[PDB]
Amino acid sequence: EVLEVKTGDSITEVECFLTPEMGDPDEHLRGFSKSISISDTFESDSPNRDMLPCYSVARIPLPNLNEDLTCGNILMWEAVTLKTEVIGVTSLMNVHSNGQATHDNGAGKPVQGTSFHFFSVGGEALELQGVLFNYRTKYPDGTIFPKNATVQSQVMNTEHKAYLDKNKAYPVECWVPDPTRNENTRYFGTLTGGENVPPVLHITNTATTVLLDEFGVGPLCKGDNLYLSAVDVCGMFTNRSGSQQWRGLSRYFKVQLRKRRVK
Amino acid sequence: EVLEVKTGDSITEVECFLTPEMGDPDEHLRGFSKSISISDTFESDSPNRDMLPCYSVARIPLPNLNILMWEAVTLKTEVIGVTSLMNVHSNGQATHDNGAGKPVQGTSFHFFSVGGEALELQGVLFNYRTKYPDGTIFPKNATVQSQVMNTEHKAYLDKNKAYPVECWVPDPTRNENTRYFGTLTGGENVPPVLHITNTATTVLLDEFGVGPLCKGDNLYLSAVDVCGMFTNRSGSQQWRGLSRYFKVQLRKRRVK
Amino acid sequence: EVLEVKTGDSITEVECFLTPEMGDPDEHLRGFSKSISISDTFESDSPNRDMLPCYSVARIPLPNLNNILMWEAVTLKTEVIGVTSLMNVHSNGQATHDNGAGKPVQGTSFHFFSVGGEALELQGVLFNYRTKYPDGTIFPKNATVQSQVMNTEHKAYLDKNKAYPVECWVPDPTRNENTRYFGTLTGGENVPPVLHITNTATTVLLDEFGVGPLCKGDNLYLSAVDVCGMFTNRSGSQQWRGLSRYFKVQLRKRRVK
Amino acid sequence: EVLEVKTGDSITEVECFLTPEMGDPDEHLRGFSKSISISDTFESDSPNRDMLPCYSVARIPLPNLNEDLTCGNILMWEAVTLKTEVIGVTSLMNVHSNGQATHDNGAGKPVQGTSFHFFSVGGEALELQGVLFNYRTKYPDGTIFPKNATVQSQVMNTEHKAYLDKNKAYPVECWVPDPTRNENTRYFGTLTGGENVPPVLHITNTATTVLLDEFGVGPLCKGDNLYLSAVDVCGMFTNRSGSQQWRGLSRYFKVQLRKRRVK
Amino acid sequence: VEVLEVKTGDSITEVECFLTPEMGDPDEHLRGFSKSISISDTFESDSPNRDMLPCYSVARIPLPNLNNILMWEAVTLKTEVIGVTSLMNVHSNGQATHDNGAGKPVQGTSFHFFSVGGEALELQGVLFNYRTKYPDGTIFPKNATVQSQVMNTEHKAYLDKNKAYPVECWVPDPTRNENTRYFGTLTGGENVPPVLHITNTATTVLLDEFGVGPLCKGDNLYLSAVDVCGMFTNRSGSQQWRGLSRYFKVQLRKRRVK
Ligand SMILES: CC(=O)N[C@H]1[C@H]([C@H](O)[C@H](O)CO)O[C@@](OC[C@H]2O[C@@H](O[C@H]3[C@H](O)[C@@H](O)[C@H](O)O[C@@H]3CO)[C@H](O)[C@@H](O)[C@H]2O)(C(=O)O)C[C@@H]1O
Ligand SMILES: [Cl-]
């Protein structure tokens, strides 16, 4: 299956940013959701599309390989390393833009509370498994959500399989990486839950993640395409009124790739 | 007596989900407990079965071998559905006027084990006068000494939806043939911190390079993943649990 | 003079649990203290015996040996027993809010363990030198205001159970050459317990010279405190709650002169 | 093309401190911002200059290299190591002046809440990317801010490129290090957000950061100049009235450099 | 100094001692505590009482006389805070956390600091408020200006006296202290929990990147410490700093120098 690395135009780099998809409720609110409203009963949960943060995905074309007929073997791009970080972490220091004061005469409350920080690099679409907080939640038109939901969907219903293959579509609260698949992807995520959780965001151009498995093989890019996926829900912004909106930020990716021969 | 590892047909892998057992108080509430109620005295503590999270267990039959035994070498594991806890809109309690719903938070217990036989348990009671309900398996002949250590309370995790998390722990005096890991984080306001990655492996070999050996060609997987409590609009609180993924690599080992 | 390790009959293991000594104020409350009450002044601080957690200790005899041979402690596995009991939030606790669950055990904790070839050596330090400690405890005597920072008179051995109150004694860092000790104080009213359990973790007890505790008279000394925090009952009154500690120690025969 | 390190006057050291630039609202309040005011609407956000912390920067001249004509080769100073620390951490124990009591008869509230701790060492100016919390924020005269802002500026507008080439000018909340550039700079930053986050400030003269990349090459100093950049927003001070001011501290740098031949 | 070979064989010595804390000691019963903390109405009126100000602790330890000369080189340190369990006294004139509750424990701003040097710790002055009037009996930054709130290079001192150098206006000078190793953490916040570790198993190596430790000038070793653990809240709500002693064990060896 996997043979030697090519040396000597044998390496390439992908550098890009993925924008967040927090719901964008009007022309002025890119990076924010709609304010969160709470259903009157548990069974009537019915979130609007613009209140639901979704997974981000980019498919990046790589230099075309195998332009001439080959015999029993091909080249594939192998993703070897990743640098990543959240872009615009200092924007969360704006505590003066019509937020809710911490106390009388105080500054605005900063973005804080529940966060999900997630990134993946793969040679194909991230494979997802559905899990629902509430199987009677009515998910809205324009989203791709677990179908034929049962009470078992609240813990594990193996019917709920999907590919992260569309932007602004797969709600964060419905889907996770499928650990039974993703052989050709490396994924990393942290959920920090709680209304008062402080954002802790590190930036450096000195940190590298190695994407090689225990056999020294990185993701292999099918069709000369690289799949990047992210979520960076940083917390909620609290308006003067008390209403709360999810706030997301963009994620930087730099991936180094090498040509690998495979049978 | 443990001899050489077979090479070549000599490896297998187990992959599965263990669903949580939080109490499931009605046909809509898989993954949740009944809302929690408080006794007015220690002597009147009588929790209903559907208010008690229990240990999860699966006995997984392996390919029949016979001697040779399956040896568990490595584990990948993670909690499945961590993002579901971002639902802050399903009739929860607003943090403040016009605010979002309070997220799942508070006391958690995250636990998993891999063994070649049932997890061995030791009983310890918060309150020795607690009356545990019909259909649970609980420390019997409890005394005030049961609040710190009573060696009578020995059991095997040999039944699903049976062994309440609050009365049992892994027995550190046994479990020679099991590897176990758990963390209790206590407090009504503790934030869930849940990591997911397909790049993390736990090695199950002891200091002598021997992994759990599967008696009768059976692998035992155990879990608890109490994530915290959900607060309803009324203020009532239910435990919330999530499923745990296990991938175990095994190899054939000659013994005796 | 420490000489060679014996190989081959050369090894033994000790396995046991130490119960917590929290004060046990009645026949139903083993593992709890009395409810905490507060003095009106520093000079009137007068805590009752059943309100003071104490250090736990076991002296464990080893196989008789008699360059001479001595038992050398090399490795320790340890963990808190019954961490999941702290999930009982339905037993006369104070609701965290209207219709809510009981407040779990939380706040000030002390988790400590030591392994030695002789009794743990203690130094007394008092929060308040005017505290009147109760009959049946062993406490710093002839206390002065200097006892609030460092009075070298306050030297003791942890040589008795249910006796040495946690708040007036610490391991003496000027002694304890023949013991290995480890402790964490986490202070504050709302601190969450964080309790880890696993049978895969070992502590090596060898010093920088490759030498472990050497057991005088073939006795091993195990000490512990596991104050996990406070339990708040329906009335708001607070009690210390403790749990037992498991120890497993591997020992080997060492020749000495 | 990087060649061999010169040995033997082949080494030099830079030592200095960067003062913080928090806004300095009067002649007594060096190191503090103006008290924070909250806009009446999200659209009307218009912070005053003395309410905005800015990035700090110093450019340090090194011993002059290449005084004689050379042929195809030059020497450059290469930055190899950094010692850095926040100067004055114990000042935050002043809880006895002009403060708001934590409770009846209690001590003053200490400096706490949102912090940004950042430093960089480079052979040229730090390259910046603009990200705005609110694209309709009116930034004040005397600051250098992202121009021609659009709603996209709330997540990622690639027009917003700058150099940290002026002190007291680039607002912290507008700008981050550009991860798509900065090949010749090493940067490190942490945003800890939240109204009540406690400052955690470590000092030691025993800690060293190595500035070499994966090829053993540090920042190379163009024109024999070293660029140091810092932000140390420690949190907010709370007045008796409840009014809150950012508080910053100075940062110490010690950089060891060696002469490197390059072709 | 040219640093030459280490002596082997009579070539080692050790120093073991404790430094008491200096929190202000406002009466004959309150050793280890400051005076209750009060709040001036303005920066201009900030006039802290001497017994309300914690100070750096220092000990100069004479070593065995040695004298191309030999100097004692500090190689390793074991250190810990003494009496951590004393903070479990929540029954002594404390403010109840809630109705019928236990006393509020020591919590809030802490500073834990220690240093080992072959000469006095070098200090740099930094003022929260340049208009603070430091009291008679303290050694404080002189000729303060508004620049003293960020960096005024005039404010240079030696930690050369006890009960003198207030913690809040002095830090180790990072521009000097070549011949010292220093370590400190400030943990701010009104409600921060103390987290105090003890063990006799932890050693700090004091050698720099060239394998050289502090070299003791005139055969004197300088130990310095601060252990402000947080504040104690009494029944009225008034708050006092509380400190604890620090243990030091330093191993030293003879080093030839020119
Ligand atoms: C997640 C969830 O289900 N939340 C609900 C919660 C839980 O189901 C229980 O607490 C689990 O033990 O129940 C809440 O209501 C408690 C009361 O229910 C009343 O019945 C209602 C029911 O709640 C409605 O949904 C239904 O449409 O109508 C019923 C009225 O006939 C009972 O009569 C009353 O005794 C309580 O049990 C709760 O607040 O605890 C509602 C949560 O949404
Ligand atoms: Cl000499």
Find the residue in A nearest to B85 (Cα).
Answer: A133
Pocket of ligand 1, beta carbon within 6 A: A 41-42; B 25, 29, 32, 34-35, 91, 232, 234, 236, 238
Query: 């790739």: which residue's tokens?
Result: A257
At B51, is the secondary structure helix, strand, or coil?
helix
CA A93, A98, A103, A106 torsion-angle sign: positive
Which among A234, A199, A228, A178 has a CA at the least distance from the CA of A57?
A: A228
At B141, is the secondary structure helix, strand, or coil?
coil
Q: What is the gyration radius of the CA atoms in chain D, in angstroms?
A: 21
Which among C32, C53, C33 has a CA at the least distance from the CA of B127?
A: C32
Cα separation, B101 vs B234, in Å, equals 12
Q: Which ligand is nearest to the CA of B28?
A: 1
Under 8 Å between Cβ of E56 and E125: no
Distance E256 CA to ligand 2 centre (A): 6
Q: Which residues contact A159 (CB under 8 A, 6 or more apart)?
A: A146, A147, A148
Query: 């008869």: which residue's tokens?
Result: D105
Q: Which residue pairs, CB below 8 angstroms and at least 24 apart, start in A165-168?
A: A165/A57, A165/A125, A166/A57, A167/A21, A167/A54, A167/A56, A167/A57, A167/A58, A168/A21, A168/A54
Cα separation, E81 vs B234, in Å, equals 47
Cα separation, B116 vs B113, in Å, equals 10
Under 8 Å between Cβ of B38 and C102: yes
Q: List B92's β-bridge partners, or say none.
A: B232
Q: List B76's β-bridge partners, or say none.
A: B247
Under 8 Å between Cβ of C173 and E246: no
Under 8 Å between Cβ of C81 and B149: yes
> Which residue among A39, A42, A135 has the greatest number of ligand 1 atoms within 8 angstroms of its CB, and so is best to mutate?
A42
Under 8 Å between Cβ of A234 and A199: yes
Of D42, D116, D244, the CB nearest to A107: D244
Which fold, A1-263? Polyomavirus Vp1; Chain A (2.60.175)
Q: Do E128 and D89 touch (CB under 8 A)?
A: no
Q: List D187's β-bridge partners, or say none.
A: D120
Q: Which residues contact D120 (CB under 8 A, 6 or more apart)?
A: D126, D177, D182, D185, D186, D187, D188, D227, D228, D229, D230
Q: Which residues contact D202 (CB under 8 A, 6 or more apart)?
A: D85, E184, E185
Cα separation, C161 vs C163, in Å, equals 5
CA E157, E159, E161, E165 torsion-angle sign: positive
Of C128, C148, C167, the CB nearest to E85: C167
Cα separation, E174 vs D79, in Å, equals 19
Which fold, B1-256? Polyomavirus Vp1; Chain A (2.60.175)
Under 8 Å between Cβ of B28 and B238: no
For ligand 2, a single-atom ion, which residues have Cβ within 5 Å? E 68
Under 8 Å between Cβ of C237 and B141: no
Compute the nearest-CA separation of B68 from chain C (Å): 25
Cα separation, D207 vs E186, in Å, equals 17
User: If you write DSSP's letter for every residue of C1-58 in order, what string do you get?
Assistant: -EEEEP----EEEEEEEE--BS---STT-TTBPPPP--BSSSTT----GGGS-B-EEE
Q: Ligand 1: which residue has its CA nearest to atom 2? A: A42
| Chain E CB contacts of C236 below 8 Å | 98-101
Q: Do C186 and E203 touch (CB under 8 A)?
A: no
Under 8 Å between Cβ of D104 and A60: no
Cα separation, B243 vs B56, in Å, equals 9
For chain B, the domains span 1-256
DSSP state, C158? -
Compute the nearest-CA separation of A40 from chain D (Å): 29
DSSP state, D66? -
Distance E217 CA to ligand 2 centre (A): 15
Give the tokens for residue C162: 């249910």
C-alpha distances in angstroms, C223 versus B148, C52, C61, E245? Answer: 16, 17, 15, 24
Cα separation, C184 vs C122, in Å, equals 16
Selected for mutation to probe chain C from B49, B122, B184, B210 (highest C CB count within 10 Å) is B184
Q: Do D189 and A208 touch (CB under 8 A)?
A: no
Under 8 Å between Cβ of A251 and A233: no
φ/ψ (deg, to 5) at D224: 60, 45
Q: Do D92 and E109 touch (CB under 8 A)?
A: yes
Selected for mutation to probe chain B from A34, A37, A38 (highest B CB count within 10 Å) is A38
Resolution of this entry, Å: 1.8
C-alpha distances in angstroms, E146 versus D31, D32, D111, D167? Answer: 9, 11, 19, 19
C-alpha distances in angstroms, D242 versus A105, D37, D49, D104? Answer: 5, 12, 21, 15
Burial of A211-239, coded b for 16+ CB within 10 Å and e otherwise, reads beeeeebbbbbeebebbbbbbbbbbbbbb
User: If you write DSSP's letter for every residue of E109-173 in order, what string do you get?
Assistant: -EEEEEEEESSPPEEEE--SSTT--PPTT----SS--GGGGT--TT-EEE--SSS-SBGGGEEE-
By the 10 Å C-beta count (0-12 exposed, 13-18 middle, 19+ buried), D1 is classed as exposed
Q: How many angstroms from the chain centroid is the CA of residue B98?
A: 37
Give the tokens for residue A89: 């972490």
Cα separation, A99 vs B232, in Å, equals 27
Report the relative pairing of strands C244-256 and C109-116 from DSSP bridges: unpaired
Question: Where does B137-234 show beta strands of DSSP type E?
Answer: 154-156, 168-170, 178-185, 193-197, 202-203, 218-231
Report the relative pairing of strands E69-82 and D185-192 from DSSP bridges: unpaired
At D125, is the secondary structure helix, strand, or coil?
coil
Under 8 Å between Cβ of C22 and C255: no
Q: How many angstroms from the chain centroid is the CA of residue B91?
A: 28
Q: Ligand 1: which residue has its CA nearest to atom 40? A: B236
Q: Do A187 and B193 touch (CB under 8 A)?
A: no
Under 8 Å between Cβ of C219 and C61: yes
Under 8 Å between Cβ of A70 and A188: no
Q: Do chains A and D touch (3 or more CB pairs under 8 A)?
A: yes
Cα separation, B183 vs C198, in Å, equals 9
| Chain C CB contacts of E81 below 8 Å | none
At E108, is the secondary structure helix, strand, or coil?
coil
Cα separation, D132 vs D37, in Å, equals 18
Q: Cα torsion at A12, A17, A18, A20 (round to 10°)?
A: 170
List subunits contacting chain A, requiring 3 or more Cβ pairs under 8 Å: B, D
Report the relative pairing of strands C169-171 and C121-124 from DSSP bridges: antiparallel
φ/ψ (deg, to 5) at E169: -120, 5
User: If you write DSSP's letter for every residue of D145-206 in order, what string do you get?
Assistant: --SS--GGGGT--TT-EEE--STTTSBGGGEEE-TTS-TTEEEEEEEE-STTPPPEEEEESS
Cα separation, A40 vs A150, in Å, equals 21
DSSP state, A120? E
| Residue B151: count of CB within 10 angstroms of its CB | 11
Which fold, C1-257? Polyomavirus Vp1; Chain A (2.60.175)
Cα separation, D128 vs A130, in Å, equals 39
- Nearest 5°: the CA angle C86, C90, C96 is 85
Q: Do B38 and C91 touch (CB under 8 A)?
A: yes
> Which residue among B232, B237, B238 has the greatest number of ligand 1 atoms within 8 angstroms of its CB, and so is best to mutate?
B232
Under 8 Å between Cβ of E108 and E231: yes
- Nearest 5°: the CA angle D44, D50, D56 is 115
Give the tokens for residue B213: 């050996």
By the 10 Å C-beta count (0-12 exposed, 13-18 middle, 19+ buried), E49 is classed as middle
What superfamily does domain E2-258 belong to in CATH? Answer: Capsid protein VP1,Polyomavirus (2.60.175.10)
Cα separation, A235 vs A248, in Å, equals 8
Give the tokens for residue C127: 């929060």
CA B22, B26, B30, B36 torsion-angle sign: negative
Under 8 Å between Cβ of A156 and B19: yes
Cα separation, D14 vs B114, in Å, equals 56
Which among A89, A84, A83, A205 has a CA at the least distance from the CA of D186?
A: A205
CA E160, E162, E166, E172 torsion-angle sign: positive
| Residue B232: count of CB within 10 angstroms of its CB | 19
Under 8 Å between Cβ of A45 and A59: no
φ/ψ (deg, to 5) at D138: -90, 110
Of A38, A118, A152, the CB nearest to B91: A38
By the 10 Å C-beta count (0-12 exposed, 13-18 middle, 19+ buried), B130 is classed as buried
Q: Which residues contact A224 (CB under 8 A, 6 or more apart)?
A: A61, A62, A63, A64, A65, A76, A77
First-last CA distance in chain C: 5
Compute the nearest-CA separation of A162 from chain D (Å): 27
Give the tokens for residue C10: 């050369």
Under 8 Å between Cβ of C89 and C232: no
| Chain A CB contacts of D186 below 8 Å | 204-206
Cα separation, D42 vs D40, in Å, equals 7
Cα separation, C129 vs C168, in Å, equals 10
| Chain D CB contacts of A90 below 8 Å | 116, 131, 172-176, 191, 231
Q: Do B107 and C87 touch (CB under 8 A)?
A: yes
Cα separation, D186 vs B180, in Å, equals 42
> Which residue among A38, A41, A151 has the greatest number of ligand 1 atoms within 8 angstroms of its CB, and so is best to mutate?
A41
Burial of C32-51, coded b for 16+ CB within 10 Å and e otherwise, reads bbbbbbbbeebeebebebbb
Cα separation, B137 vs B153, in Å, equals 11
Q: What is the 3-state composition of chain C as percent helix, strand, coil, each rounded to the nearest 5?
A: 5, 40, 50
Which among A259, A262, A260, A235 has a CA at the least distance from the CA of A247?
A: A235
By the 10 Å C-beta count (0-12 exposed, 13-18 middle, 19+ buried), D66 is classed as exposed
At E38, is the secondary structure helix, strand, or coil?
coil
Q: Ligand 1: which residue has its CA nearest to atom 37? A: B35
Distance E181 CA to ligand 2 centre (A): 25
